Structure formats: C-alpha cells, structure tokens
C-alpha cells in the first residue's frame, strides 16, 4: 500500500544499535511530514572542543570554541554523524575537529563510530527528503557575514516551549540542506502543539533525558539550545556527552510505500522507496585536486612579478593571470575600463569566476545611472588563481580576511607583506595598462623597488586608465568593502560572488568607487568642508541652503534623516546606498552620471525622466520641505503617487481634470562647460485616437515652454579625470529644475482614455524624453566577438546589456581586440527589437 501519513503515525525505518528506529510523524508542514525518533537514539555531544583545525570553518570564528565546542550546525559533529553512511573511522567531520577523546566530555569518543545512516539501506535513505531549512546562526557567524538572509535580530531566550519560538523567523539564519537533522525551536514547539508532552524525550530505560536541538544561543559563541527532562528549552555547552540525540527527517511521501504495518505504535509502517533515484548521499563537498589546471583559456594573460613585499610566503612570486574581455564595444581610450579580479577562486574554478563577473556586471548595468553608460564600459575579468577557496581558509591570492565588523580587508600582516593592499595600483594595474589597454602605457617604475620622492606618486596614472578595480570573492558570505583613498593609491572594492545580495552589493560598492557616493546610513554631523566634500549626504537642515534644493520635489526627493534624531541627511529614504534593496536616488543618478561623463567624452546632457503630476501646490515651495523626518518622506511619496499622471499612472488622467493645473517637471544637467543649451518642453492632452485634445472653441490643448540650461563651470572641480578627491564643488552648476505648468481649460473637451503626452525637445527637434520613456521596453543585447569563419574568439565572454527598444547602437568598434584586428561589425546601426539580439564583432586571425 501507499500510506497516508498523519500526525502520530509511527514508521519503523533504519537500524541503529541493532534495533530498528521507531520514528513518529510529529508535525506536517510545507517540506513534508516530519519524522522524529521516538526515543533518544544515543547520548552524544553536539560538537567537540577544537582539536585539529582552529583556522578553518566554525572553530575559527570564535576562540572560545576551543574551550566548549561550536554552536554552528552546518559544521557540527552532529550534522556530520547524522548524515553519514560512512564505515567506522571514516565519517567526514565537516568542521575538521572530530569528536576525539578528551574533546567530548567523559567517555565520549564517537569518532570511530559509524555514521547514523551507515547501517541503513540505500532505499531507506531515499525515503528521507533532502530539505533546505533555515538554521539560525550565532554571532561568530553573523559577524563574519555567514547568513543566507536579511534578518537582523538575535533570538530572544525564553525557556518555556510556548515562548521559545519568539523572534525565530526574524532572527539571523542561513539555509542548510540535509536529510537527517535535529529539531529547531520552531519544530520542537510544533511537536509540542501537535503531540502534547512528546517534546520531552525518553530513553530506552524510560527515564526522561535531555535532547539536543540545532538552534544555537545566538548571543553566545559556543552554547546550544536543548530540551531538558523537565521540558525546559535551555542552553548547554556542546562538548558534553550527557545529552541525547533525537534525529528527525522529512518523509518523501510520494515514492514511499509501506510493505507492512498499520503505522500504530505496536505495529509501525515499515517502508522505503525503491524506484526513487538519487546519487549516493554525501553532505560532504566533492574533493578537488591539489594541483588544478585552468578551467579557462590562458592564451591571453598578464604575468606579474610579485616580490617579497607583495608575496612574502612566495606562493605568488610570478603569477600568470588569464584575461577575459566581457565587453569591448569601443576602445579603452574612449571607454571606461573596469578590471574585476578573483579571490578564493582556484584554477579549476575560473570559469565560475567569469560567469560570476558576467552575472554581477549585467545586474549592475540594469541600475541607472550605469544603464545609460552600459555600452561605454569596457569590462575585463582577470583570473587570479588562489591556492584554496575562501571558505577553506588556505592561502588566497589577495589575502582577504574579514575583520570583526564584517569588513573585508586585504591584510598585509597575514603573510607579512606590507604592500598587499597596494597590489592593484602598483602591480596589477600597470601591467594591465601596458598589455591589455589600448593606451599601452609602459610601466615607469618597479613595484618591488622603492620610489624616490613619494611612495604613492608614480602609480597615480593607473586610476586614470582604469575606472574601477573590483574583487569578487568565491563566497556566500555577505560582506562589502569600498576603499577609495587615491592619495595612497587605493581604488578598489571587495564583494561576494554568491551572497543573497551579491549583485546589489556589487552595484552599491561600484557606486562608491566610480560614482563617488557615500553610505546614506552612516551617522555623524558633516562639518563645513566635509559637507562640501559629500555628493549625496548633507547636514544642512534649511531646504533653501541644501545642495539638492533644485531637485527637491522631483520624483522621490524629500530630504530626510537616515536614522532618528540623526544629523546626517539624505535626499530619499530609499536609495541603494542606505538599503541595498532599493534603487539609486535622483541625487545619486545625477552625480554619478556627471562623474561618468567626466570619464567619457560623448555625453552632453542629462535629462532625468520627466514626470507629469497634478498641481495641488503641495510640496511646491522650499518651506514645505522643512520637516526632515522619515515619516514625512513617506507622506510625500503618498501625495506624489496620488498626484502622479505619468508613467504607470498615465491612465490616472480623467474627464474631470478640466480647470486643473498639471505640472511637467524634470531636472536637466548641462554636461558642457562651454555652451549653454535651450530645450523646449511640449505638453498636450492626447486622445486615445492620437490627436491633440481641444477646448470647446477648437483651440488645441497644448503648452510650449523653452528653458535654457546653463553651463557647468565647476566641472573642473567635480571628479575630473586625474582627480584624487572631490574636495569641493557646486551641486547647482549646470543644473536646472524645469517645470512647465499647464491650466487645463475649464471648458476643455475630455473623453475616456485621454492621457498627458509630453516631448522634451532640443533645438533641432530631437526628442530627448517623452511620455513613453519611463515605461519603455528594455531589450537585451548580447555582444559577441568572433573570427571571420564564425569561430568564437578565445578569452572573450560576451555579456548582455539592456538598451531601449528601437535603439540603434552607434559605437565605433574597437580597432584591435588583443592582437586581433577588426574587420566588421554585425548588428550595429540597426534597431534592436528582440530580447537576445546579438551584435557580432568580427576580428581577424
Ligand atoms: Zn565542530
Ligand atoms: Zn557603501
Ligand atoms: Zn542616493
């Protein structure tokens, strides 16, 4: 038969200690029916003290785990034993500290013990569903960024089972997938609710026994929550062998078939799932080779001579770094060159690096202000082999450590290399510019020698020719680092490859490095000179004096404090700089666009997406913008949406809007210091048919207003090429907030489906923006680099960037790709209309 598993069902699956284990389905939940050992299978210790390795995995993150053991579940001796089929003496102990004698209290010694699953048959293991569950993480874990999700709180400690679950879902967590697991607090309380006093365990004698739970004490580094004989959830040090094991699995109901039994306590459902197909169960990671080979091509490479100051141990004394062109739309001189490098990527895992870079890069290019410049970035991935992965703790190429604050820092001290943080500017950068870059600037100085006048001066050229240095770490850890002191040569960011926020963190850190933007969450008064120094942060309360006064009232720009009472002020509560979920704010888009325009010579104007809003007069004057609370910001956003007649709200227009003023508004920045720009704005009510709407007397309902945008004199002072810092500049230079207000006539003829239509025209009549722009379709373009015969050029991994629909890409193709010479381009100067359009640059050899 195929059973139906109810709460209280008893199954007899597997054998431990030569007795089949009676499991009971305590709860039914989303993953499946939950089977819990009826009696504590054995009396063992969650995790022994640190014996073998203290520099890798859980025992590394706190040194008190030498004394007591580790409350990390993924590494635990319990997870390793419960989920092992291994023969005796061969259980992989994931943390690397086995449950050896003298590290588990008392007799202990469950190293040399066969895995729990070893005596089981393969079919019985198949019947346990491989489930991905949240496991709360302790402070050593959540300060080294070992967290799969957003949630910020420590679990509150309540001993009663009723109150034990408090804060669980809001608590720090990471997701672990396994067949056999010890119950967490939520699941123990579920067992309680469904099955009364069954949450108190009983051993073979029948005396009540404490049993371990996988929930750690989030405030503590070693302690583990456990269920005692009385029934109190409590904390025990994990090294002790007094406490019991009550393993639980999730039945895979569909394949499961019970050959015998009714599921009663006396007569359990005896069953397994034969036809279910699985690779042999191994929670253990596959073992890669000691000496890898490159997954990727080495045909195009840069070779670095790193002396003692850069590699004191000597493992990177002459690295060969393969180079991959993810994007080379134009020449390096004309474009912004981004160099991404790899941390904790072994030779065999370099393909992953390339794909990761592509992933992250493309996701970053979905964000504006980058999207406007997507085709202007030259993107290069440098394959920097690491002897070990980041999580293995072996020597990594860049020596990245994570400090106590979750900050990822290249450590000069770790291998005793004083100048490791200077590797990008002094070692990697000069070689890239000499070899890969079209400028081919020969290296004037020896990084290994000592410069004569300023130890930081000669390397200043690197940052001109390379816009950004990025480091991607082969980690699911969540951390971000931005290092932006050009005087001392530091222009680089460190970000993770597979964190839940990997692409968001990448975009954020890129915003520091290239755009120059600061963290909007940071708390602290900005004094006068520092206040001039910050592009996106101000401590000026008065709306009339604030830097972004012109942009106030545009889209979601209301000036608000980042945190309560704080003297630090931001243009929008929702920006990527404060919260990585949210997109870049208008001040950031403007300032980053201006910075990138300094880097590339084509752009002449910035037109923010115009918005048509009804003109109540709310938020129309500087006084209205005085309140600086976050609540007031959200009230402004509500009023804006209730007024908005543009974009997605283009259909909010109605027959009643006669006698009502409507306001078209944009912010326009003139990127040209030399010549001022006259831009015409046209706003007419549009019938669904498409003809301009009329009043009763037939006069068209349309408004025209010509705004002249001034020159950008302070251009030289705002992030010029060749600039160490933004010491002072004027926000308002070259910036005009253009507002056209139209009184819809009181006698106007309005029908259903009429919508406001606006063209922002230049002098020649080219339409810079229109009512379709905000909603306009973005179509993916893939750039490919091929030989004449159609064979793929090696060391090129073309990315995908989004261009607006109907965009005709007109970018002079780069004369040379590596030593290859450009013969033709396919797909340029043609409307891009399909997602997945491919532009193929053909080079010859
Ligand atoms: Zn351990
Ligand atoms: Zn930041
Ligand atoms: Zn912002």
Residue numbers in the entry: 32 to 876
Structure paper excerpt:
The sole known peptidase capable of cleaving both IgA1 and IgA2 is IgAse, a unique enzyme encoded by Thomasclavelia ramosa (formerly Clostridium ramosum). IgAse is a ~ 140-kDa, seven-domain, membrane-bound metallopeptidase (MP). Differential scanning fluorimetry, small-angle X-ray scattering, AI-based structural predictions, mass spectrometry, and high-resolution crystallography and cryo-electron microscopy of multidomain fragments of IgAse revealed a novel 313-residue catalytic domain (CD) from the igalysin family within the metzincin MP clan. The CD is flanked by an N-terminal globular C-type lectin-like domain and a wrapping domain (WD), followed by four all-β domains.
Recombinant production and biophysical assessment of IgA1, IgA2 and IgAse — To investigate the interplay between IgAse and IgA, we cloned a panel of seven peptidase constructs, which included the wild-type CD and the inactive E540A-variant, in which the glutamate acting as general base/acid for catalysis in most MPs (hereafter “catalytic glutamate”) was replaced with alanine. Subsequently, we obtained a high-resolution map at 2.8 Å with a 300-kV microscope, which enabled us to build a near-atomic structure of the NTD, CD, WD, and Oβ domains. No map density was observed beyond Oβ due to the intrinsic inter-domain flexibility of the sample (see Section 2.8). In a second step, atomic displacement parameters and alternate conformations were refined against the raw map to obtain unbiased statistics. This process was repeated iteratively until the final structure was obtained, which encompassed residues S32–N876, three zinc ions, as well as one glycerol and seven azide molecules from the concentrator buffer, and 151 solvent molecules. A comparison of the CD + WD + Oβ moieties common to the MX and SPA structures reveals that they are essentially identical (core rmsd = 0.61 Å), except for the surface loop T480–S485, which we attribute to crystal packing. Moreover, we identified a glycerol molecule attached to the catalytic zinc instead of the formate of the crystal structure. The main difference in the structures lies in the presence of the NTD, which was defined at a slightly lower resolution than the adjacent CD + WD + Oβ core. It contacts the CD on the right surface of its USD through a small surface spanning 424 Å2 (linker excluded), but not the WD and Oβ. Overall, this minimal interaction may explain why the NTD is not required for CD stability, and IgAse constructs lacking the NTD are comparably active to those that include it.
